[PDB]
Amino acid sequence: AQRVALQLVAIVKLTRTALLYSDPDLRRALLQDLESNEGVRVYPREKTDKFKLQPDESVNRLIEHDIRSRLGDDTVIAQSVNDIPGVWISFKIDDDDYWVALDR
Amino acid sequence: AQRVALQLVAIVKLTRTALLYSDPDLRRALLQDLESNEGVRVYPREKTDKFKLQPDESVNRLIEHDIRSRLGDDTVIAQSVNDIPGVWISFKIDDDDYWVALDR
Ligand SMILES: [Ba+2]
Ligand SMILES: [Ba+2]
Ligand SMILES: [Ba+2]
Ligand SMILES: [Ba+2]
Ligand SMILES: [Ba+2]
Ligand SMILES: [Ba+2]
Ligand SMILES: [Ba+2]
Ligand SMILES: [Ba+2]
Ligand SMILES: [Ba+2]
Ligand SMILES: [Ba+2]
Ligand SMILES: [Cl-]
Ligand SMILES: [Cl-]
Ligand SMILES: [Cl-]
Ligand SMILES: [Cl-]
């Protein structure tokens, strides 16, 4: 529980941080780097993006509990967004909502 | 071996990325965020910074092998730099050398 959640939290936080402090002119280039080089796909999150939860198997819900405690109670953790499989974790910068998608 | 190394690689890569694409005016502020919020201390690496290897115990050398395969053959991995304990991993942006220090 704790260990997996800690790693996922670290990834989301470092990714959000990279975006937060990014040179606005290089922000699109940064998103390409994160995806290709770090395997981290960032997307804007639209209010109408649909999602499906990870199953209640193994320690998923405990992992999810620990992630929200560290990232924020309103964090969405999902196994798909708009029918696209992955490990999906939402985050925010100010008024802007985002997804991070990782490979399962 | 693989798993620990993969996580450390991810941290170093995301950290380097954040720095690489950072707004130059916010770069010092970014370093504060990484340290306080992500527990990642970045330092410039000076050619005369001394270091001490992690012991050859457990799977340390295998972890180190996997880290270098992903980050670069010239990567230094150390248990201390200038007598300061931690998990230290070097990285570069162009001509500039850096350390990342994590808690053990
Ligand atoms: Ba909290
Ligand atoms: Ba919003
Ligand atoms: Ba809002
Ligand atoms: Ba809202
Ligand atoms: Ba919004
Ligand atoms: Ba290589
Ligand atoms: Ba140099
Ligand atoms: Ba050099
Ligand atoms: Ba050199
Ligand atoms: Ba140098
Ligand atoms: Cl953008
Ligand atoms: Cl979905
Ligand atoms: Cl600087
Ligand atoms: Cl040392």
Give the minimum alpha-carbon distance from A81 to chain B in angstroms, rounded to a whole number: 23
Q: What resolution does the deposited structure have, in angstroms?
A: 1.9
Instruction: Provide DSSP, chain A.
Output: -HHHHHHHHHHHHHHHHHHHTB-GGGHHHHHHHHHHHH--EEEEPPTT--EEPPPS-TTHHHHHHHHHHHH-TT--EEEEETTEEEEEEEEEETTEEEEEEE--
Kindly report the backbone phi and psi dihedral angles of residue B15, in degrees, each rounded to the nearest multiple of 5, phi listed first: -65, -50
DSSP category for residue B56: S
- The residues of A whose Cβ lies within 8 A of any Cβ of B are 7, 10-11, 13-15, 17-18, 20-24, 26-27, 29-30, 33-34, 37-38, 40
Domain ranges across chain A = 1-104
Which residue, among B21, B32, B35, B103, would best test binding to A if mutated, counting the most A CBs under 10 Å from its CB? B21
CATH of B1-104, one of 3.40.190.10, 3.30.565.10, 3.30.450.300, 3.40.640.10: 3.30.450.300
Query: How many A from CA of B46 to the centre of ligand 7?
Result: 8
